[PDB]
Design a protein around this ligand. Sequence first.
Ligand SMILES: O=C(Cc1ccc(OCc2ccccc2)cc1)NC1(C(=O)O)CCN(C(=O)c2ccc(-c3cccc(Cl)c3)cc2)CC1
Length: 266
Amino acid sequence: KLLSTVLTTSYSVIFIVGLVGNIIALYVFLGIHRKRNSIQIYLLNVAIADLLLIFCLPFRIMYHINQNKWTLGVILCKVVGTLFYMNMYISIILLGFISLDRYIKINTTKQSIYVCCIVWMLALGGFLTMIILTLKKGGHNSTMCFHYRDKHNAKGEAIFNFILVVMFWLIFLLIILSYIKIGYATTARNSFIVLIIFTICFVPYHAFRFIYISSQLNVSSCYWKEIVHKTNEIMLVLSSFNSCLDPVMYFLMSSNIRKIMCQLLF
Ligand SMILES: O=C(Cc1ccc(OCc2ccccc2)cc1)NC1(C(=O)O)CCN(C(=O)c2ccc(-c3cccc(Cl)c3)cc2)CC1
């Protein structure tokens, strides 16, 4: 109903804007650059991950068009879920490294390539392990995805959520202390953009997860879980907003983005 239609509109607009921005940014990064120290590599991989999320969005949009009905199987459903989170976590780790990298400057290249390549292999490995468990179980083909599921007998799965939510806080914690130390004019202003994106899109999402996981391992009334279900779907949209806050971040990290954007606007 109302929740479905607001999600449809928000997802449509976010997909369009993110697609345009990521396409332009990826074109500029791929077709102009010859020598890259570390920032170009980091921003290129961030652009690729954003492109992945943008290409994943239309399936969820179509799902919300059809009044919450799924008719394409289970494998596609789990592929969509896996890709969405996967991009969420890649974006949190590679945005961490840009700050850590952009602090030694104020206070070479082969090391940044090593870290950059490791992240993609572990994300790819985690993609495969979700497919294998889907085929093995091979359960009845239910028509209900993107919906609340209970984990009363699946406490191990709650541990997957439990590890991530706490681990995100250390990454958020270290970024704060890094800024405090730092807290040259251009460098200081730019690094403040990293904190803006990190605090708006991602910080709210993990905070409410404590209540969400708490209701999972507990008995809940009819009123309670409906409100929790209402909150999470809206709460995910805020996390998916990083696809459009990243393009403005490209603008302040390099002049090539600035020059092409200036050419297009002028
Ligand atoms: O960026 C990543 C990969 C990563 C790689 C290395 C890391 O440190 C090593 C390292 C760090 C810095 C430098 C050098 C080395 C840390 C993370 N992120 C993942 C993770 O390891 O934290 C998490 C998402 N991920 C899934 O496979 C995945 C999970 C959960 C779901 C899911 C959850 C709920 C519902 C549903 Cl349906 C699905 C889906 C997929 C990839 C690995």
